């Protein structure tokens, strides 16, 4: 039951996609890859495509196909960027050489669209809850994001949210450094390697994202990793003896006990004026001890969500198999894997 394909290039590029899929134009220029927006006749729904050419050039490209395309198959939740189809022009694994991923058109991001100013408690409170929402099904999955800032959120124009980049965090060191939005979000544990981290990284950035959507400012732009780490202990305190000790990483260890002591400030002196349920879950989700921070499902339930919450209504996903991160395997065998994930996908009901 293969479809019809057609071909039409777009900005010196080659797209090759079933009929079904209409009106196709680019997004983006290029700077984020080959995407494109497209009109989806057989469902009636607007998409997003992204076309991976040459996913299997080596070694590490082949195993991050696949991995990018296990991820997004996955995930299947509203607050969570999905597949609705998944398709190659390929008739056997010899010529497969490509892969299309198809998603719902959100058609801007949360940095495009907010930055610099400070939304209202309501606009907030709908933002936060859907990204708690979906962090609460992607971690009920074992999958970390990592890499959770406004412009990994996907957003339309009624503010409804999807969660882009989950899973895939290959940062170069050099787009880590100075001025960065690369690296503002992330908790301290990760962006100094403190120690094994998990989940709870990711609560870390939210609460980066919601202290700026209320504020309308940075809450911690710094220079540098050293001038960061700085700002976020001014904030939130020093860390104390049980904290310390977590610190696996020695020289991490030795270099935080070089700074002198401070103690955690006052966030309603901070964040002057905002809702008190919204500086109480702040509280919640940046402290320092990432087994202290609140988690997704609990965040969900706090008054603050009040207007939002539904325990009937923020579900769980199936767990995840990642245990293909620890092996070894040649191009050909990863090219194998994904042309199985790709012919064996089956739309969404
Ligand atoms: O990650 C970004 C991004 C962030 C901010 C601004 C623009 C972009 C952008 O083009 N990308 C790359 C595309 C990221 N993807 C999606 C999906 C839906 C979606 O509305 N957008 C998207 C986000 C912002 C501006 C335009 C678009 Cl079209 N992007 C995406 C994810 C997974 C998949 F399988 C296919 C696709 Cl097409």
Redesign the pocket.
Request: glycine share 4%.
């Given at each position: 039951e293969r479809p019809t394909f057609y071909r039409q290039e777009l900005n010196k590029t080659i797209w090759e996609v079933p009929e079904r899929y209409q009106n196709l134009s680019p997004?983006?220029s290029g700077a984020?890859?080959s995407?494109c927006?497209a009109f989806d006749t057989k469902t009636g729904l607007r998409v997003?495509?992204?076309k991976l050419s040459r996913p299997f050039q080596s070694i590490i490209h082949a195993k991050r196909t696949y991995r990018e395309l296990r991820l997004?198959k996955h995930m299947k939740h509203e607050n969570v960027?999905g597949?609705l189809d998944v398709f190659t022009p390929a008739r056997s694994l010899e010529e497969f050489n490509d892969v299309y991923?198809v998603?719902?058109?959100?058609?801007?991001?949360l940095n495009?669209i907010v930055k610099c100013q400070k939304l209202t408690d309501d606009h907030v409170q709908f933002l936060i809850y859907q990204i708690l929402r979906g962090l609460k099904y992607i971690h009920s999955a074992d999958i970390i994001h990592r890499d959770l800032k406004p412009?990994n959120l996907?957003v339309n124009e009624d503010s409804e949210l999807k969660i882009?980049?989950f899973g895939l965090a290959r940062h170069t060191d050099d787009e880590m450094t100075g001025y960065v939005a690369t690296r503002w979000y992330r908790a301290p544990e990760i962006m100094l390697n403190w120690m094994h981290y998990n989940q709870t990284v990711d609560i870390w950035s939210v609460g980066c994202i919601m202290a700026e959507l209320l504020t309308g400012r940075t809450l911690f732009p710094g220079t540098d990793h050293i001038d960061q780490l700085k700002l976020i202990l001014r904030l939130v305190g020093t860390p104390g003896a049980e904290l310390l000790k977590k610190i696996s990483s020695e020289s991490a260890r030795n270099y935080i006990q070089s700074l002198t002591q401070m103690p955690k400030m006052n966030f309603a002196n901070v964040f002057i004026g905002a809702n008190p349920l919204a500086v109480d879950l702040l509280e919640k989700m940046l402290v320092l001890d990432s087994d202290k921070r609140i988690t997704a499902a609990q965040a969900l339930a706090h008054a603050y969500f009040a207007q939002y919450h539904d325990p009937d209504d923020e579900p769980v996903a199936d767990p995840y198999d990642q245990s293909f991160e620890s092996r070894d395997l040649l191009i050909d065998e990863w090219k194998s894997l994904t042309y199985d994930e790709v012919i064996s996908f089956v739309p969404p009901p």
């Amino acid at each position: 039951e293969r479809p019809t394909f057609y071909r039409q290039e777009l900005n010196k590029t080659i797209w090759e996609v079933p009929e079904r899929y209409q009106n196709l134009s680019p997004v983006g220029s290029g700077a984020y890859g080959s995407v494109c927006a497209a009109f989806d006749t057989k469902t009636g729904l607007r998409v997003a495509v992204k076309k991976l050419s040459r996913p299997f050039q080596s070694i590490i490209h082949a195993k991050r196909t696949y991995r990018e395309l296990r991820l997004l198959k996955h995930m299947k939740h509203e607050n969570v960027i999905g597949l609705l189809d998944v398709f190659t022009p390929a008739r056997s694994l010899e010529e497969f050489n490509d892969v299309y991923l198809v998603t719902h058109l959100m058609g801007a991001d949360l940095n495009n669209i907010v930055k610099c100013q400070k939304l209202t408690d309501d606009h907030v409170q709908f933002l936060i809850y859907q990204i708690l929402r979906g962090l609460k099904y992607i971690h009920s999955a074992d999958i970390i994001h990592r890499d959770l800032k406004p412009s990994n959120l996907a957003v339309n124009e009624d503010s409804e949210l999807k969660i882009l980049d989950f899973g895939l965090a290959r940062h170069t060191d050099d787009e880590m450094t100075g001025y960065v939005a690369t690296r503002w979000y992330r908790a301290p544990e990760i962006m100094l390697n403190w120690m094994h981290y998990n989940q709870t990284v990711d609560i870390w950035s939210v609460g980066c994202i919601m202290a700026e959507l209320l504020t309308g400012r940075t809450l911690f732009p710094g220079t540098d990793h050293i001038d960061q780490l700085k700002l976020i202990l001014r904030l939130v305190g020093t860390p104390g003896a049980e904290l310390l000790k977590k610190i696996s990483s020695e020289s991490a260890r030795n270099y935080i006990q070089s700074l002198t002591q401070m103690p955690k400030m006052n966030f309603a002196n901070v964040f002057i004026g905002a809702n008190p349920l919204a500086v109480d879950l702040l509280e919640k989700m940046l402290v320092l001890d990432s087994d202290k921070r609140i988690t997704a499902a609990q965040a969900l339930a706090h008054a603050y969500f009040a207007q939002y919450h539904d325990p009937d209504d923020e579900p769980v996903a199936d767990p995840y198999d990642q245990s293909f991160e620890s092996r070894d395997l040649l191009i050909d065998e990863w090219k194998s894997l994904t042309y199985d994930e790709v012919i064996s996908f089956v739309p969404p009901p």
